[PDB]
Amino acid sequence: QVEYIQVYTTPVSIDCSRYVCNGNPRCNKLLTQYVSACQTIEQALAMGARLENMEVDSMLFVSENALKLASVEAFNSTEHLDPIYKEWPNIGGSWLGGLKDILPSHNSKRKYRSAIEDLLFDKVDEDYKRCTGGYDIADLVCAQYYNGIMVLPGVANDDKMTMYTASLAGGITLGALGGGAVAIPFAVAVQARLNYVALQTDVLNKNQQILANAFNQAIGNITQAFGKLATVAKALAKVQDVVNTQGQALSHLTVQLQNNFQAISSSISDIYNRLDPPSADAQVDRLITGRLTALNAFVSQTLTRQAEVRASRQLAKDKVNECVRSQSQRFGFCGNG
Amino acid sequence: LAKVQDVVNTQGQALSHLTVQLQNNFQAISSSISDIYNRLDPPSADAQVDRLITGRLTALNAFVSQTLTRQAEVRASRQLAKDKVNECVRSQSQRFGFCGNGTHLFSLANAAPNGMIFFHTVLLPTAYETVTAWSGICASDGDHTFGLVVKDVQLTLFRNLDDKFYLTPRTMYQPRVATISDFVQIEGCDVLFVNATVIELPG
Amino acid sequence: QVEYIQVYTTPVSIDCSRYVCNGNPRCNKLLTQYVSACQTIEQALAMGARLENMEVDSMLFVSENALKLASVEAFNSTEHLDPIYKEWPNIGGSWLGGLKDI
Amino acid sequence: NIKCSQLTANLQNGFYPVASSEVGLVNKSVVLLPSFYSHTSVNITIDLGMKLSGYGQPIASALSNITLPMQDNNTDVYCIRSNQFSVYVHSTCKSSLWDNVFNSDCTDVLHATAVIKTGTCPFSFDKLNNYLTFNKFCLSLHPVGANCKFDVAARTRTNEQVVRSLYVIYEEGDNIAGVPVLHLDSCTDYNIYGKTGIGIIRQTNSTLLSGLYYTSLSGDLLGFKNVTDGVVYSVTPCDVSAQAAVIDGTIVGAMTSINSELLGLTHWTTTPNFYYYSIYNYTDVDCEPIITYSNIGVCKNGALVFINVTHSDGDVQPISTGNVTIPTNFTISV
Amino acid sequence: KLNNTNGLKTYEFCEDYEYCTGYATNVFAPTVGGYIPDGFSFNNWFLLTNDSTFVSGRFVTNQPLLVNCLWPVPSFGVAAQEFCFEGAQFSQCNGVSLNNTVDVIRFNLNFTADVQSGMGATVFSLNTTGGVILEISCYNDTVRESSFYSGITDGPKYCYVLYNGTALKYLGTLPPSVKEIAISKWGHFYINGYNFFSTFPIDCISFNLTTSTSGAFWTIAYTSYTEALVQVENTAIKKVTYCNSHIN
Ligand SMILES: *[C@@H]1O[C@H](CO)[C@@H](O[C@@H]2O[C@H](CO)[C@@H](O[C@@H]3O[C@H](CO[C@H]4O[C@H](CO)[C@@H](O)[C@H](O)[C@@H]4O)[C@@H](O)[C@H](O[C@H]4O[C@H](CO)[C@@H](O)[C@H](O)[C@@H]4O)[C@@H]3O)[C@H](O)[C@H]2NC(C)=O)[C@H](O)[C@H]1NC(C)=O
Ligand SMILES: *[C@@H]1O[C@H](CO)[C@@H](O[C@@H]2O[C@H](CO)[C@@H](O[C@@H]3O[C@H](CO[C@H]4O[C@H](CO)[C@@H](O)[C@H](O)[C@@H]4O)[C@@H](O)[C@H](O[C@H]4O[C@H](CO)[C@@H](O)[C@H](O)[C@@H]4O)[C@@H]3O)[C@H](O)[C@H]2NC(C)=O)[C@H](O)[C@H]1NC(C)=O
Ligand SMILES: *[C@@H]1O[C@H](CO)[C@@H](O[C@@H]2O[C@H](CO)[C@@H](O[C@@H]3O[C@H](CO[C@H]4O[C@H](CO)[C@@H](O)[C@H](O)[C@@H]4O)[C@@H](O)[C@H](O[C@H]4O[C@H](CO)[C@@H](O)[C@H](O)[C@@H]4O)[C@@H]3O)[C@H](O)[C@H]2NC(C)=O)[C@H](O)[C@H]1NC(C)=O
Ligand SMILES: *[C@@H]1O[C@H](CO)[C@@H](O[C@@H]2O[C@H](CO)[C@@H](O[C@@H]3O[C@H](CO)[C@@H](O)[C@H](O)[C@@H]3O)[C@H](O)[C@H]2NC(C)=O)[C@H](O)[C@H]1NC(C)=O
Ligand SMILES: *[C@@H]1O[C@H](CO)[C@@H](O[C@@H]2O[C@H](CO)[C@@H](O)[C@H](O)[C@H]2NC(C)=O)[C@H](O)[C@H]1NC(C)=O
Ligand SMILES: *[C@@H]1O[C@H](CO)[C@@H](O[C@@H]2O[C@H](CO)[C@@H](O)[C@H](O)[C@H]2NC(C)=O)[C@H](O)[C@H]1NC(C)=O
Ligand SMILES: *[C@@H]1O[C@H](CO)[C@@H](O[C@@H]2O[C@H](CO)[C@@H](O)[C@H](O)[C@H]2NC(C)=O)[C@H](O)[C@H]1NC(C)=O
Ligand SMILES: *[C@@H]1O[C@H](CO)[C@@H](O[C@@H]2O[C@H](CO)[C@@H](O)[C@H](O)[C@H]2NC(C)=O)[C@H](O)[C@H]1NC(C)=O
Ligand SMILES: *[C@@H]1O[C@H](CO)[C@@H](O[C@@H]2O[C@H](CO)[C@@H](O)[C@H](O)[C@H]2NC(C)=O)[C@H](O)[C@H]1NC(C)=O
Ligand SMILES: *[C@@H]1O[C@H](CO)[C@@H](O[C@@H]2O[C@H](CO)[C@@H](O)[C@H](O)[C@H]2NC(C)=O)[C@H](O)[C@H]1NC(C)=O
Ligand SMILES: *[C@@H]1O[C@H](CO)[C@@H](O[C@@H]2O[C@H](CO)[C@@H](O)[C@H](O)[C@H]2NC(C)=O)[C@H](O)[C@H]1NC(C)=O
Ligand SMILES: *[C@@H]1O[C@H](CO)[C@@H](O[C@@H]2O[C@H](CO)[C@@H](O)[C@H](O)[C@H]2NC(C)=O)[C@H](O)[C@H]1NC(C)=O
Ligand SMILES: *[C@@H]1O[C@H](CO)[C@@H](O[C@@H]2O[C@H](CO)[C@@H](O)[C@H](O)[C@H]2NC(C)=O)[C@H](O)[C@H]1NC(C)=O
Ligand SMILES: CCCCCC/C=C\CCCCCCCC(=O)O
Ligand SMILES: CCCCCC/C=C\CCCCCCCC(=O)O
Ligand SMILES: *[C@@H]1O[C@H](CO)[C@@H](O)[C@H](O)[C@H]1NC(C)=O
Ligand SMILES: *[C@@H]1O[C@H](CO)[C@@H](O)[C@H](O)[C@H]1NC(C)=O
Ligand SMILES: *[C@@H]1O[C@H](CO)[C@@H](O)[C@H](O)[C@H]1NC(C)=O
Ligand SMILES: *[C@@H]1O[C@H](CO)[C@@H](O)[C@H](O)[C@H]1NC(C)=O
Ligand SMILES: *[C@@H]1O[C@H](CO)[C@@H](O)[C@H](O)[C@H]1NC(C)=O
Ligand SMILES: *[C@@H]1O[C@H](CO)[C@@H](O)[C@H](O)[C@H]1NC(C)=O
Ligand SMILES: *[C@@H]1O[C@H](CO)[C@@H](O)[C@H](O)[C@H]1NC(C)=O
Ligand SMILES: *[C@@H]1O[C@H](CO)[C@@H](O)[C@H](O)[C@H]1NC(C)=O
Ligand SMILES: *[C@@H]1O[C@H](CO)[C@@H](O)[C@H](O)[C@H]1NC(C)=O
């Protein structure tokens, strides 16, 4: 069964002075008269992001030995297997037919990325050095950057989270912690899990082949669904909603720069090219007021969303600690069954 | 410290913003009702005061909405705090990683502005003991062969220098002598079991 | 002890063009320049209601055999009892006094 | 400058928003559609009459006169019939002695100048010669049919009084332009097809077949086309946002998108997202990060480090087979 | 397809223009109701604008995209007509015409140097409201205002609006990449989709055009305004969807 949980938001940096005034030196002096108006917005936005980064950083971790074992090549080789496990062909064994779709592979563009991660990041701009050359007409992101709106990467990143999950997957087969990367077969770990569920008293007629085949077929049907089973549909809908909301929020802020706010024009250069300064100042004050109200609303909505993602991340931390790094004794917590 | 400071600053700012809206005249000649009624005749003064009334009602609605949202968030936080108190302070939890990073020993609490601070005391290891473990014992009574496994799946079975069987937990290394009541007898054996005779079996 | 927890909201559907324009043919022609504005509103509401329906439907379930026994009448009878409980008058027993309100 | 922007003279260590550069003196570029050249001068003559009130203060008469150029045997309505125009005001002063008879020149106390103020119009009179375009512009002394009006005032050393009103009838367009090249690869003040701003214009080899000019979602000009050879030009702002790193009241580095010097910093390095300028002698490094931001950190010597994830030995697994490790020597963490 | 080499002439039959040449044609037959087919290329077709031009996106717009008639001009052929905006049911139409009144007339032609006018220097002749006759004329030399000019030329072409044989307005030089000219009966002229100039409302317009020895074939479309969702990529039309049914 598949479950999606959101851990972090996408951090957004707003240059309040460049949003309100489009670099106009006459508008900056007018905005100065609003005491600590841009400073408050910038400080609130920065404090929220710093708090989220601090909360996230105290949750992700890696171990080198488990990272050395978390790949399709390592699971398909007999290199790290302890000498007693001589009869086993490799680490993955009969489970590999599923584990190949979840484990990272070198046949991928990015490090520590798996096939399902590729499908998710394709089914469902960070470099701003391209927006200054002027070799073509700017796109939406470069224009937003020109309006003082930047999207930055945080401590919570698609790279750190991939390392985190790969280390978690590879730590299942790590046999000891003191020294080098010693490994055990996956079937041994599955047998330990079965013993935890109920003490197995039939040591001869083991039928782990049935479970392995069922797991392989289920993982294959999940991989099919992610590229073209109600849990998969719910997860896809949830991820799509999360992605869409942030983009809508960003675009609604850019559409407010086309609002007159009961002025003759929406352009500060157009106002200062047609009116004497005593009247142009009175026309620009209304735009300043409206564009500050828009930023205040954006900040409030961002803080509310961060407040909800805090609880979502607490739930994700509990799921990792009690379903992935151990076996939970709580009924119905890690799925139905 | 960052969390406490942010909580205090946000509370203050909400009330400050609510108060600052009484200096706003909503397209009226003044934001003072007394001045309006002092400068204008009642038919015009009422139409002037209507704008102030509408704007102030809108401000109150905004304040109420933000207050209710904050209260819901703090309700969730209070549920988490109650869980922490019940499962980390008033008892010892069997959940992995709930009361801090490490093996939870105990917890204490102190009062903080608008909430609590928890001190979680956990165990931190500095060394590992390496032992050769076994999944069971394949016992042969001359001709009859059976197997012995461990009742408690949380214990590890190993052998000392004198080839006596010992059990230890995996949370801490606290070896103990294995007795016959610690095992379950089963029909089959395993290739990963240790071979022993009835002479070397646990007493 | 008694506890209440909310599980779902009451969903609402809005026809954006009927709310803004009271069915007026001429007002709709002006709203076409805001066709993206109404589409954004309607999609946000429909997606939120579809996701709450998905999560509620994966939580509730019934058992056919358990629903047969779930009544005051069935607890007051001995029809479904295992024959080894012949010494007991009914399912409810002395707890039926409080179970009749639940 | 950072202290003045942050409204404090004691800056704590951290990152602060700055501009990649500052804009000083610039050239003006104007681009319009082709047309015939026919220019007219519109001279407006304003004769003010002043008297001295019983309190000893200057009073401007309502019998002041405005004269427009002669058109169709009249001087009360003058309109434009050419492609370009300029406007000028010529003022005169006379004095009276409560008899409303103006025969003497204006004295030092009574001297006044004629000023045309905006009134209700959406433009200023002095700004008409700043490349404003109309489909119709036409001035009158009568209020019928007027879209707006200017205010004619007399300004004296101690006062300013409105005496007359000048009415305007206009229709928006581009047929008539009020008047007083193209500069590339430098910050310039541009007026291109009525779009005004400040930025850098560059020639691109892109091929857009449709339209004349292109704007962003907020209404800013992104590019335009030359009507002669169909070459597309791109317009960018001539400054961008940057982040300055301040440690102990000094600038140690700056993250930016333009590969140019800023804030007095000389050395630089390239990271997958930006350029980092610094005092550190660049051509990794080992130092402790003093300040942190996003996924990076900055040390006291103005060096850049990348923050990694935390490392741990690993979790103990529930496996009893082979050589296994059990934690033994325990201390306390709080 | 004709191939002449050293006096030897060969010819091949082509069923699909794209197969024989590699790029699509602009000749199409409108469906029932006057709608452009669903796989058209929109090569000399633009979105009309009085403002900035959309570069990429999807927009619901009221545009002259209802085809009353499409007239394919055969290679080495002349298209001449004095059209008043009132009905376009002619025998030259490709497909089924409509009896609605015409709003816009579009010439989907590459206005290169191979295009020649049978009216002389005049390209278009406009009869406006009240019988006032205006003329669009392109010359090989500049003309002073209120003066007059004093077979094909080479070099720049300067285009003018003439009222009584004298230059009334200067439009500019003819650019090298004009691909469509749309004229509205209210007097608006669109060149590559942009409204460059306007006149008085047009009662009737006359023209006489040919592509000379190029052998090129082009089209004239008589069109009416309709509501449609248009997708644009790089300022070019990619797909048009009419709101002509419930699902649409
Ligand atoms: C949850 O809690 C656990 C504790 O239970 C944390 O795990 C410990 O994390 C620390 C920090 O990563 C680990 O310690 C580090 O081990 C490195 C490897 O040790 C080698 O070198 C030493 C000698 O230095 C040898 O004795 C040893 O055998 C290895 O060969 C050390 O290099 C690290 O040294 C640190 O200090 C020096 C001095 O400045 C630095 O140069 C280093 O870079 C480094 O910072 C350090 O000792 C420790 O082993 C982990 N223990 C366990 C039991 O896992 C988790 O990190 C924590 N999780 C979260 C999310 O916070
Ligand atoms: C009006 O003005 C337009 C300009 O917009 C002219 O359009 C171009 O004209 C040329 C000449 O006919 C066309 O060229 C053909 O292009 C094909 C390749 O094209 C598609 O893919 C490329 C991507 O690389 C696009 O750039 C291109 O636009 C096309 O969409 C070639 O395959 C053709 O030649 C090949 O095939 C033929 C036949 O098989 C062989 O004989 C050749 O040797 C060769 O192998 C050819 O070069 C081009 O497609 C037109 N561009 C368009 C429509 O966008 C019009 O021709 C012009 N019309 C008039 C009346 O003058
Ligand atoms: C670029 O900019 C120009 C200039 O603004 C725009 O020009 C206008 O274009 C529209 C067409 O989209 C013209 O509209 C038409 O005006 C006709 C004349 O109006 C008089 O008569 C009507 C009643 O018949 C009165 O209501 C009105 O007040 C006038 O007295 C109308 O007759 C037209 O409507 C008729 O045709 C339509 C179909 O086309 C039918 O639906 C109607 O029922 C009716 O039969 C129509 O309203 C408008 O006049 C132009 N304004 C001018 C010339 O100044 C361009 O549209 C704009 N281009 C783009 C692409 O943005
Ligand atoms: C998705 O899940 C379905 C099962 O619900 C998978 O179909 C199953 O495919 C296996 C083959 O891998 C079928 O196997 C039986 O397998 C033996 C193998 O030797 C073969 O000899 C038998 O003839 C038979 O095929 C299994 O029956 C089949 N189940 C059904 C219901 O058809 C399907 O392959 C999965 N898709 C993936 C993994 O993408
Ligand atoms: C845990 O710590 C103890 C105490 O430091 C270690 O015991 C010492 O081991 C060394 C090496 O064998 C001996 O030389 C010392 O004499 C021991 N000390 C005492 C007091 O007995 C012990 O080795 C550690 N456990 C490990 C490393 O697993
Ligand atoms: C939905 O399922 C319920 C049981 O979960 C069905 O309830 C049964 O309804 C029939 C006909 O009314 C009764 O005779 C049974 O006693 C009910 N069963 C139980 C266990 O109480 C219900 O009919 C189902 N609905 C549909 C439309 O199929
Ligand atoms: C359970 O069943 C008993 C037995 O039928 C019910 O007790 C009867 O109640 C009625 C009135 O409803 C009296 O007239 C009878 O005398 C009672 N019978 C007895 C006491 O043997 C009893 O009400 C039922 N309880 C429930 C439904 O909760
Ligand atoms: C403004 O013009 C008026 C009208 O021409 C001038 O007033 C006239 O002055 C002359 C003497 O120059 C008298 O004969 C007329 O009788 C006056 N006319 C009226 C209607 O009073 C006036 O002097 C001018 N004002 C100035 C120059 O300030
Ligand atoms: C549009 O292109 C034309 C033609 O390339 C440019 O006109 C040239 O301008 C330069 C610089 O003033 C002159 O040296 C050339 O002689 C001009 N050529 C012609 C043919 O006139 C024109 O400047 C471009 N437009 C803009 C706004 O720069
Ligand atoms: C577990 O570790 C022990 C040592 O603690 C290993 O035993 C040694 O194995 C090496 C390599 O074969 C021999 O040279 C030593 O003589 C052995 N030592 C003793 C004391 O017997 C043992 O092989 C390891 N077990 C596994 C399953 O890997
Ligand atoms: C037109 O026909 C000529 C010949 O009349 C073709 O030229 C020949 O091309 C072939 C390759 O296909 C060469 O091997 C011959 O040597 C050429 N012949 C001559 C006489 O030069 C030409 O390719 C044709 N053009 C087309 C098909 O576009
Ligand atoms: C379009 O222009 C052509 C070219 O001028 C006209 O063709 C001329 O027709 C007249 C008779 O009407 C002949 O005397 C000329 O010799 C023709 N000139 C040529 C063939 O070059 C044609 O008539 C015009 N079409 C119209 C007005 O419908
Ligand atoms: C321009 O159009 C006007 C429309 O009125 C034409 O004038 C009409 O011409 C017809 C010719 O049969 C006369 O019967 C009408 O009496 C005229 N009407 C008016 C109101 O004068 C005019 O001829 C056209 N001009 C050209 C050069 O074709
Ligand atoms: C008389 C009107 C009766 C209305 C009945 C409503 C019917 C179906 C539900 C429509 C809303 C579905 C929720 C959002 C999800 C979606 O739009 O797919
Ligand atoms: C020949 C009939 C009248 C033509 C009038 C031409 C004058 C001005 C229009 C300029 C159009 C520029 C369109 C873009 C051209 C290009 O992409 O090269
Ligand atoms: C135990 O004996 C069996 C044969 O009975 C042999 O195959 C196996 O290897 C032995 N196991 C050990 C751990 O010595
Ligand atoms: C303006 O252009 C001239 C050349 O015409 C150039 O020398 C000068 O530096 C420019 N001025 C500014 C302020 O950039
Ligand atoms: C208008 O005034 C100017 C000075 O501003 C003068 O030189 C010129 O001759 C006048 N033009 C006229 C009266 O047409
Ligand atoms: C304008 O007035 C003059 C006298 O200054 C007169 O001769 C002339 O005829 C008038 N113009 C017209 C068109 O009547
Ligand atoms: C930076 O170091 C280089 C050698 O790596 C040296 O040549 C140069 O002078 C240094 N620059 C300074 C110290 O400013
Ligand atoms: C950061 O962590 C990665 C992944 O473990 C490692 O490859 C890299 O060397 C680390 N960087 C430093 C400076 O230690
Ligand atoms: C136009 O055609 C329609 C059918 O398409 C017909 O009903 C109508 O009468 C026709 N109008 C005229 C004026 O002929
Ligand atoms: C235009 O063409 C005429 C002959 O048709 C020629 O005399 C004249 O010089 C040409 N003008 C130019 C500028 O080439
Ligand atoms: C047009 O010019 C002719 C002479 O070519 C002249 O007779 C006529 O009056 C003029 N018409 C107009 C309206 O200027």
A316: tokens are 């994700």
Q: What is the Cα–Cα distance from E13 to C62, expressed in whole angstroms?
A: 72
Which residue is it, tokens 């000028």? D88
CA of A89 to the centre of ligand 16 (A): 20
How far is it, in rounded angstroms, from Cα C85 to Cα C64? 23
Contacts of E189 (CB under 8 A, 6+ apart): E181, E182, E183, E195, E196, E197, E198, E199
Kindly determine whether residue B121 and residue D333, on different chains, have CB atoms separated by under 8 Å.
Answer: yes
The DSSP code for D70 is: P
Contacts of A64 (CB under 8 A, 6+ apart): D311
Percentages of chain B per state (helix, strand, coil), in multiples of 5 = 40, 30, 30
Task: Report which DSSP code applies to B159.
Answer: E
**What does chain C come to in residues?**
102
Q: Which residues contact D242 (CB under 8 A, 6 or more apart)?
A: D17, D18, D19, D20, D254, D255, D256, D257, D262
Q: Which two tokens stand for residue A122?
A: 């394709």
Contact present, D and A (at least 3 Cβ pairs less than 8 Å)? yes
In angstroms, the CA E104 to CA E64 distance is: 7
Which partners does chain E have (≥3 C-beta pairs < 8 Å)? Answer: C, D
What is the rounded distance in angstroms from the CA atom of residue A3 to the CA atom of residue A5?
Answer: 7
Cα atoms in the 13 Å half-sphere on the side-chain side of B75: 7
> C-alpha distances in angstroms, D225 versus D41, D197, D199, D229, D231?
32, 17, 16, 9, 6
Distance D47 CA to ligand 8 centre (A): 11
- Please identify among residues 291-330 of chain D the ones whose CB lies closer than 8 Å to any CB of chain E: none
C58 to A237: CB separation less than 8 angstroms, yes or no? no
Q: Is the dihedral of CA A309, A310, A312, A313 positive or negative?
A: positive
Helices H, strands E: what count in chain A?
14, 3
CA distances from E222 to A88, D304, E92 (A): 78, 66, 12
Q: What DSSP character marks residue B180?
A: G
Question: What is the Cβ-side half-sphere exposure of residue D44, based on CA atoms within 13 angstroms?
Answer: 25
D227 interface with E at CB cutoff 8 Å: yes
Residue numbers in E near D34 (CB within 8 A): 170-173
Q: Which one-letter amino acid corresponds to residue C52? A: E
| Distance of alpha carbon E205 from alpha carbon D106, whole angstroms | 64
User: What's the CA gap between A112 and A160, in Å, rounded?
Assistant: 9
On the CB side of C60, CA atoms within 13 Å amount to 8
Distance of CA B141 to the CA centre of its chain: 52
User: What is d(CA B150, CA B135) in angstroms, rounded to the nearest whole number?
Assistant: 8
CA angle A296, B66, B23 (to 5 degrees): 60
Alpha helices, H only, chain B? 2-20, 33-39, 42-84
Question: CA D296, CA A153: separation in Å to the nearest integer?
Answer: 10
Ligand closest in space to the Cα of D73: 19
User: Is the backbone of residue A250 left (phi > 0), alpha (psi -120 to 50) or beta?
Assistant: alpha
Number of helical (H) and strand (E) elements in chain C, helices listed first: 6, 0
Asked if residues A39 and A15 have their Cβ atoms less than 8 Å apart, the reply is: no
Q: What pairs with residue D155 in β-bridges?
A: D113, D160
Does residue B97's CB lie within 6 angstroms of at least one atom of ligand 1? no
Q: How far apart are CA D34 and CA E174, in angstroms?
A: 12
DSSP 8-state code for residue B87:
I
First CA to last CA across chain C, in angstroms? 14
* Chain D nearest-CA residue for B153: D318
Triad D91, D92, D94: Cα angle to 5°: 150
What gap in Å lies between CA C27 and CA B100, rounded to an integer? Answer: 61
Rounded Cα distance, D116 and D142, in Å: 17
What sign for the dihedral angle of Cα D181, D183, D189, D190?
positive
Whole-number Å distance, alpha carbon C9 to ligand 14 midpoint, is 15
Cross-strand pairs, D78: D139
Nearest to D328 by CA among A177, A180, B133: A177
Integer-rounded Cα Rg, in Å, for chain C is: 26
Question: Is A234 in Cβ contact with C54 (below 8 Å)?
Answer: yes
What's the length of chain E? Answer: 248
Residue D173 gets the label, from left (phi > 0), alpha (psi -120 to 50) or beta, of: left
> Do the Cβ atoms of E95 and E30 come closer than 8 Å?
yes
D205: helix, coil or strand?
coil
The β-bridge partners of D139 are D78, D168
Give the Cα separation of A84 and D278 in Å (integer): 56
What is the rounded distance in angstroms from the CA atom of residue D125 to the CA atom of residue A192? 89
Chain D positions in Cβ-Cβ contact with residue B192 (cut-off 8 Å): 321
Could you tell me the two tokens for E113? 């140097």
CB-based burial, D94-110: b 16+ in 10 Å, e otherwise? bbbeeeeebeeebeeeb
Amino acid at A173: T
The partner residue sitting opposite A201, judged by closest CB among B6, B97, B186, is: B186
Q: Least CA distance to C55: which residue of chain A?
A: A234
Burial class (CB in 10 A: 0-12, 13-18, 19+), D151: middle
Q: Is there a contact between D38 and E55 if contact means CB atoms under 8 Å apart? A: no
Kindly give the pairing relationship between strand D39-52 and strand D84-95: parallel
- The DSSP bridge partners found for residue D56 are none
Q: Which amino acid is at D182?
A: L
Among residues A86, A228, A206, A110, the alpha carbon closest in space to that of A161 is found at A110
CA D47 to chain A, closest CA, distance in angstroms equals: 24
Task: Point out which residues pair with E63 in neighbouring strands.
Answer: E226
Residues from chain A that touch B192, judged by Cβ atoms under 8 A, are 84
- B41 by Cβ neighbours in 10 Å (0-12 / 13-18 / 19+) ranks as exposed
What secondary structure letter does DSSP report for B134? E
Tokens read off for E165: 């044989």
Cross-chain Cβ contact D208/E145 below 8 Å: no
Q: Which chains touch A (3 or more CB pairs under 8 A)?
A: B, C, D
CB proximity A35 to B under 8 Å: no
How far is residue A10's CA from residue A256's CA, in Å, rounded to a whole number?
Answer: 21
Per CB-CB distance under 8 Å, the chain D contacts of E169 are 35-36
- Residue D311 beta carbon below 6 angstroms from any ligand 1 atom: yes
Ligand nearest to the CA of E132: 13
Q: Which residues contact A204 (CB under 8 A, 6 or more apart)?
A: B187, B188, B189
| Angle, helices C35-57/A230-254, rounded to nearest 10 degrees | 150
| Residues within 8 A of D (CB atoms), A 125-184 only | 126-129, 131-132, 134-138, 140, 143, 145-148, 150, 152-155, 157, 160, 163-164, 171-172, 174-178, 182, 184
Compute the distance between CA of residue A274 and CA of residue A266 in angstroms, rounded to an integer.
Answer: 13
CA distance D94 to D60: 10
Ligand 19 center to residue A52 CA distance, Å?
83
Phi, psi angles (nearest 5°) of residue D238: -95, 15
Min distance A148 CA to chain B CA atoms (Å) = 25
E43: Cβ below 6 Å to ligand 2? yes
CB < 8 Å to C52, chain A: none
Question: Which amino acid makes up residue B152?
Answer: D
CA D241, chain centre distance (Å): 17
Contact B137, B186 (CB under 8 A): no
Tally of CA atoms within 13 A in the half-sphere of D253 that contains its CB: 30
What's the burial of A76, exposed, middle or buried (CB within 10 Å: 0-12/13-18/19+)?
Answer: middle
Q: Which of residues 179-208 of D touch A (CB under 8 A)?
A: 191, 196-198, 200, 202, 204, 206, 208
Contacts of D321 in chain A (CB under 8 A): 84, 184, 188
CA atoms within 13 A on the CB side of B130: 7
| Neighbouring residues of A86: CB distance < 8 A, sequence distance ≥ 6 | none
What's the rounded Cα separation, in Å, for the pair E62 and E80? Answer: 29
How far apart CA D109 and CA A334 sit, in angstroms, is 94
CB D301, CB D287: distance < 8 Å:
yes
Instruction: Give the SS3 label for residue A255.
Output: helix
The whole-angstrom separation of Cα B30 and Cα A194 is: 77
SS3 A44: helix
Contact A91, A183 (CB under 8 A): yes
The rounded distance, in Å, linking the Cα atoms of D118 and D122 is: 8
Resolution limit in angstroms?
A: 2.7
Token pair recorded at residue B201: 């079996």
Residue D321 and residue B134 in contact, taking contact as beta carbons nearer than 8 Å: yes
Structure tokens at C102: 């639940």
